[PDB]
Subunit: 249 residues, 4 copies
């Protein structure tokens, strides 16, 4: 029987690449999405065309709220409902925007930025564990988490919190044989709204090839961590950044 994976924020970009690569490796996949319904359904259709009944979509807002635990429990439930098992969880979904220190309320910003990047991964981890082979969790971290961008304090706090979860959960879930690791991009796919000139500004900072990571390159590290080739690895965060984090001012 084929193993099954949940990938959050899987409709496009890095999340899609991860879902595709897992699917190509033989996983059945839950494609979680928030707003990108057309893209999610389009991906599920492609994957099911390749192998029937091996992909489903699952909609959920991962903003923090008093119902977030129920929503996270339901994402895990959706994997068991579809495939009867859940072997891998990839925490990929992420809100990302600036929150300067000097029309959303600050509390909405906290709920969205900390909810998606940290609290939802935490609750999904709880639900994944509670429900339980080669079991693992992979968290999409940030290679630049200790060289923060100006005006992004809440996002940065969320990604730092995610490092803490990765390490705490690796230790706490080790007795159950659930490995917990991270993949940390530096610069990969740039924002859709970013102009080419600005994209090039950021690309030129990367020592290895002066280019951003392809979505496939990020997915490659995820696939490694979930594989039997990483069976002794837990609590590790692999930078996939072309050396970007090593570059001084």
């Amino acid at each position: 029987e084929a193993p099954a994976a949940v990938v959050t924020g899987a409709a496009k970009r890095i999340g899609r690449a991860i879902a595709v690569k897992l699917h190509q490796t033989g996983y059945r996949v839950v494609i979680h999405y928030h707003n990108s319904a057309e893209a999610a359904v389009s991906l599920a259709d492609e994957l099911n065309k390749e192998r029937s009944n091996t992909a489903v979509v699952c909609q959920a807002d991962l903003t923090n709220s008093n119902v977030l635990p129920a929503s996270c429990e339901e994402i895990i439930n959706s994997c068991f409902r579809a495939f009867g098992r859940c072997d891998v969880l990839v925490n990929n979904a992420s809100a990302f925007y600036p929150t300067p220190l000097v029309g959303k309320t600050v509390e909405t910003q906290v709920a969205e930025l900390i909810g998606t990047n940290a609290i939802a991964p935490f609750l999904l981890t709880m639900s994944f564990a509670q429900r339980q082979s080669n079991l693992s969790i992979v968290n999409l971290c940030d290679a630049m988490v200790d060289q923060p961008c100006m005006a992004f304090s809440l996002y940065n706090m969320g990604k730092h919190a995610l490092v803490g979860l990765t390490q705490s959960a690796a230790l706490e879930l080790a007795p159950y044989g659930i490995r917990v690791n991270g993949v940390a991009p530096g610069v990969s796919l740039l924002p859709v709204a970013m102009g080419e000139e600005e994209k090039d500004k950021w690309r030129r900072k990367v020592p290895l090839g002066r280019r951003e990571a392809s979505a496939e390159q990020i997915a490659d590290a995820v696939i490694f961590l979930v594989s039997g080739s990483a069976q002794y690895i837990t609590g590790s965060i692999i930078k996939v950044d072309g050396g970007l984090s090593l570059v001084h001012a």
Copy 2:
């Protein structure tokens, strides 16, 4: 005289920080949540030394719809009492386990992430907005990358606080506001902890096989806010007697 806000200052480490700042010549806002009696008792002692140099301020620092207003009011209380706010010490902290496998989990999120991360963020915002030797000191955790079993939310909150310390150091540098951390390993043990368990944890510390006193933690805070640290920002000083260096 300069003025400082210390959160969770009624007892233990926060109290020692408030006392040392006061002894150094600061006027102090003693923030508290439940420890009203102790907060006022401290204010009384400091005011006995120098009249009208200490005030108290009550606030719950749990995350909620009203937290930003609460944090704005803490900073405001310093300006009201003293006409200035030079130093913010984020010391208040909720601390208890949250296993992965009668508070709901979301209440625990609100308390643990609120006190340790969101409130420091909002207080930092309010401190900066209102603005010499200005600085913020965040009480971090030397053991943040060697987590205790079953403490994921607390750990996530302290990791978030590292992110805030570094982010705010960079963002507030143009305003001349330094942002640093002090990271205890083991200092004052929980009051509910048995003496036998206290000894177990004490014996792990290479330097002297004992916990830090509150005063020793306060000493590093005093250094960071002082003129002797005026080029230091974004630094987190471990005050842990080597604890973080000890392998399993």
Copy 3:
């Protein structure tokens, strides 16, 4: 045409497993050794039985000395003489023994421990680059920041190796040479160590209460040299079953 790799200290244990997995992946290999001639030759014979003319041995002391640069240049040269190319360098050879702060002279200990763990990797890196999916993998130490009592020189060597890995990643990126590390926690324990002592160390590992096999360490090396890691440079992957996360 098949790529070629140099693996230092490849006769036994982790180096041997790396050389075997590289060969299984399709590499021709230079098996470097110091004292273990018989084991190096038996490995070469094994690999050559699998595929003719795909393995050679190279003897060298990697202790620091005035002849070390020539020795390291000769190791890289041996790969070119055998195979016409050198795609991968694995810095695995390592002296390991305590050097307390309080019959070898201390300068000999410096030469051996710092030579094998840091200076030889540096010189081999120079020679590798000078001759140029190219990459270098350095065998680091997941416990490098939780040092063992009385192992300061070894620890210094491995800390220097982190610096090399990062410096070389940046400096060699323009040539498309990636430079990464694999960091074991506890792997292959010495056969002669008492099982009662082995078990003491095993019990410390969260994941499985067991040391890593040499093959498990080798698996991370294989990933790092593969097409699946072509954007990864300057990264050090812990393969430690969570050991480095465990507090005192």
Copy 4:
């Protein structure tokens, strides 16, 4: 009786400022130097004029060689010979120059860069401990050690090794009450001879004030670490870098 301190490379720049501040705090000082004889003697004169018999010079090359242990032992011996005690050791002396990967031989570069930055501090630590209150050692580290500069691999390796020594010696010497800490500058006052354009280039990178640290600001952190206000601090490395290490590419 006044305590005594050894400061290596104390004739100029940061080491000089450390020596001056220790002396002002009440320490008797061994001013070690290599080439800067006139400056070392002039400093000793300045300090002795303030308080007679409280400063001596000690010349030594700290390049690695088979006699380096003897030279390091002799530096510590010189403190006991002058002052009858040795309470503080500051490892400040350091060779610094590029060593590209692609007139000195490479083994000479290894000897100088690794010797001064790592092996001499190790040997001095050994001798300091062996010859033994508020005892401590302070190592001058590099705030940028994990964001290396192009072509400085040996300097970087030396400073990385120094981090290892700081942590290793903190644990190993804890039972003897000797604390071992670090101070990590980013950029400190640049040579007046460096070009105006290049000085501006490096100064402008510093978030806090867009300027380098003074030598005195670096010394201030050393003074704190050796003081009674740091009695529980061991194995800590305090960055004094104006935020430099936090700045991304």
